[PDB]
Amino acid sequence: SMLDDAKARLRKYDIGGKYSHLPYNKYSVLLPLVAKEGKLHLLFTVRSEKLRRAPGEVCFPGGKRDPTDMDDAATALREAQEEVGLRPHQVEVVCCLVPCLIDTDTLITPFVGLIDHNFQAQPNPAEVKDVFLVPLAYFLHPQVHDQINHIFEYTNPEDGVTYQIKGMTANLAVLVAFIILEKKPT
Ligand SMILES: O[C@@H]1C[C@H](c2ccccc2)[C@H]2C[C@@H]3CNC[C@]31N2
């Protein structure tokens, strides 16, 4: 099946806990995979303005580890619940992808999660201004704009609204698309 095929591909790139004990400032992100209309999609947030860290940007759900988190996957799930109301029974964490090093003292750990078909996003307006889906296949042939910095523009065919996706978020989206969609019969 489509979902079993995706999880089996993703498992080959799981690094597990290999890098999780190193002494960094620690953040996790959840890359949430949603099946709709026979295709895979990724779920993105638009961050609120009132936030000190990173206002108005397109990002995956996530944030800073705290002392309650049992492990780095727990951080990602805690933060996804607070931002969009995703509950634990509604997500299966499939793997941990290559972490991202930033600013010399920070390590960001990405987890891929499969999302239950009955989940419906409840944006928390104190953290998130918007929540939207992008088909995974988009990231193999994106609409690119140069700010030189590469920026993707995605227009939702439902309402004509355009979103800009860039930086680590765009890099991780392309990676997940390559892992899941490369070399597939039609
Ligand atoms: O907040 C996250 C994590 C990263 C981060 C960088 C520096 C300090 C803290 C955190 C970057 C890259 C991520 C893209 N979405 C916002 C985002 N900023």
Contacts of residue 9, Cβ cutoff 8 Å, sequence gap at least 6: 179, 180
Report phi then psi at 151, rounded to 5. Answer: -125, 130
| Distant-in-sequence, close-in-space partners of 94: CB < 8 Å, separation ≥ 6 | 6, 7, 10, 11, 14, 112, 113, 114
Q: Is residue 139 within 8 Å of 182, Cβ to Cβ? A: no
Structure method = X-ray
Is residue 64 within 8 Å of 52, Cβ to Cβ? no
3-state secondary structure labels for all residues of the chain = CHHHHHHHHHHCCCCCCCCCCCCCEEEEEEEEEEEECCEEEEEEEEECCCCCCCCCCEECCEEECCCCCCCHHHHHHHHHHHHHCCCHHHEEEEEECCCEEECCCEEEEEEEEEECCCCCCCCCCCCEEEEEEEEHHHHHCCCEEECCCEEEEEECCCCCCEEEECHHHHHHHHHHHHHHHCCCCC
Q: How many residues does the chain have?
A: 186
> Which residue's CA is the nearest one to ligand 1's atom 10?
27
**Which residue's CA is minimally distant from atom 12 of ligand 1?**
168
124/107 Cα distance (integer angstroms): 26
Give the whole-angstrom CA distance, residue 147 versus residue 127: 27
Q: Give strand pairing partners of 46.
A: 58, 130
A 10 A CB-CB count for 68 gives: 8
Domain boundaries, the chain: 1-186
With contact defined as beta carbons under 8 Å apart, do 155 and 132 qualify? no
CB 112 within 8 A of CB 95: yes
Q: Compute the distance from residue 138 Cα to the ligand 1 centre, in Å.
A: 23
Measured in whole angstroms, how far is the alpha carbon of residue 63 from the centre of its chain? 12
Is 59's C-beta closer than 6 angstroms to any atom of ligand 1? Answer: yes
